[PDB]
Amino acid sequence: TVSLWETVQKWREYRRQCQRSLTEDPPPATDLFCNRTFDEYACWPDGEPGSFVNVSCPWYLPWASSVPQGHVYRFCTAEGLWLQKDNSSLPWRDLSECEESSPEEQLLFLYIIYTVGYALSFSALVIASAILLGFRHLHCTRNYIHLNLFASFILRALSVFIKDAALKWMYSTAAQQHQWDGLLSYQDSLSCRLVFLLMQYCVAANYYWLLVEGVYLYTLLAFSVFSEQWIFRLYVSIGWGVPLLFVVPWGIVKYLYEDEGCWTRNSNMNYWLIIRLPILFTIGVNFLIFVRVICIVVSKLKANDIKCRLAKSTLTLIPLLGTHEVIFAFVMDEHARGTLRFIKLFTELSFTSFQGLMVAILYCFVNNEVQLEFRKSWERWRLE
Template sequence: MYVCWGDAAANTTHAEPCPSYLPWYGQVKDGFVFRRCDADGQWVRDETDMTWRDHSQCENVNPEEEQWEAWILSQLRVMYSVGYGISLAALTVALCILTQLRRLRCTRNLIHCNLFVSFILRAVSLLTRDALLIHQHNMVQGQEDMIVLLREKTLVGCRVAQTITQYCVAANYYWLLVEGLYLHNLLVVLSFSEESALPRYMALGWGAPVLFVVPWGVVRQLYENTQCWERNDNRSYWWIIRSPILFAVVVNFIIFLRILRILVLKLRANQMRRSDRKYRLAKSTLTLIPLLGIHEAVFNLIPEESAHGRVRYSKLGLELLLSSFHGLLVAILYCICNKEVQAELRRKLKDTFTREHSSCTSRSLPPSSGRPPIGEDLISESSEAAQPIARSRQC
């Protein structure tokens, strides 16, 4: 339950290097843990009848640093939990706005809605998984026999939640890729049909993650079925999920560069001052970064296993901050602050206020015996007929 012990001669002390899984292994990598083989060829036992060992050379020489690291990780968990909670609320509001206003229904906004749903699923699954991890950790601390039985059931639910979480996170990355592909095709492909491409986008966003999340779950069940699958001790298994996500991030980054090139060429073609051109380019770039998730490409330049110490925690903190508030930023930019959405909301509120005002006025007036004036009939008919045209122009 500490290291793997080799053979030892009777009446000798046997030494093994400190185990590499210790979080402070860098400080004790030259140390050893000892066992004593008795004259009868059996390991010496202590007063509690447990096999004696001396692992004093492998103990943490700086427990204050370990406590500091635990505090940092706990604060990071609070931070990203708050971020995902706020993003969840903003995305829910944005999704309701885009789905309830009929004049905003088009291919572009439908893709936005699927992106919002992927962000919502990511937030819900991560928060649920964390709750199950805490519950499972508390049960592991117990020593009662009944809790051992309950722990096995909890582990099954926790592993299922972990698999669903990996799917939701992967789907979020692939819907960011769909946004990039849609925008690229809209700008580059001359005969691009949005309606015919929509089924392919749906299959890519929701179907592609299944192709690598399910194999990852099978491999973990067969070869690394430990705890709640929250640790990735065998990196080769983790690359089953990591490599397709990294592929989506790289493709989106290439699309981002191509779109920027197109924007630069278009802005140069327009007759405008250099300062205006730079402002338009900067504004478009800052708007595209959250839509395509370009910050993920920056973080992937520093692999997780190569970052250590304060660099690792700085990278982890910034990455969790941006990832947790990413949904909030997308909801604000592409729904709440969108001029088209704002105009439609104002029109909706105005129509509602007008209807309420007219109903109040009709109650206060004596009842009329005839139809409304012909002019009002024509206005209402023309407005009904103009809705599809206005909707197509908006989309």
């Protein structure tokens, strides 16, 4: 779609050229002609008295390439004065043929679903993190990785809320009036770009912390042992630093080129693949680790109902590794259109938004260790 800034520039050029022409053109010296003028929509040369005036359709319209043909009409009185239309500030005018030649409902639906999901996820995850940090008994490398994962999900939710607020600010009435007059607004600010850069970093950090959790679980089940402190430092580095290795280059290239969108629109997918490919690698590795862990659980269940327990263990292993993305990971943005795009967006928005909620519930609330800790802490508080 055409940008508002381009429309503003085209209108400004049209207005400047028309005003210069009308202020430089000599009088037509016609018979009782009305003096040439210019209104907010289009130009108006000298018009014959007591008759309508035909002028071609303006070329600065967003739909110029859609309906180039069109004539704008203006009425003039027989005394050389523009006709005063009924209760209108401007004289008589007609633009019916100059007009242009809904996804709001689905946007509203997806927005409500994913905002509610992220709010509930934020609440559940902050509660779970408080519970985990409050009890000193539960501290271990596994729970440290879990706390980092909870922090990543909370940051993702916060970035989503700030991004929604920034989008509201960008297309607010004040910003609209600022842009129409040619003045700087929220769109041209650096904070607008930084908001989306933070959102992308939060998303990438969340995916890489899911990968870190999966790798740690696989190393636990691969019967491999190393230095706990060095491994933990390496996992922290992978979780929080590796996303900066590509988000920063993406920010640099999107600053140097195609900055006019305030880093919001990814029209050319060649630069958006820079972010996408590491996330796809993450998804592939997590899917392979999920498959291997399910194979190990199969081996453990077979030798010591079996299918019911297999199904139960498979479902609980999805939120922790985020394997639900694999169902639509390779359905690229270049091809998802219409109903397929709707299904992809709905699934990925709804499941990911509630993914933090399920992770928090499964690994804090219904976890047997945490429940026993709660029970024993309550008993001790009643022993005081």
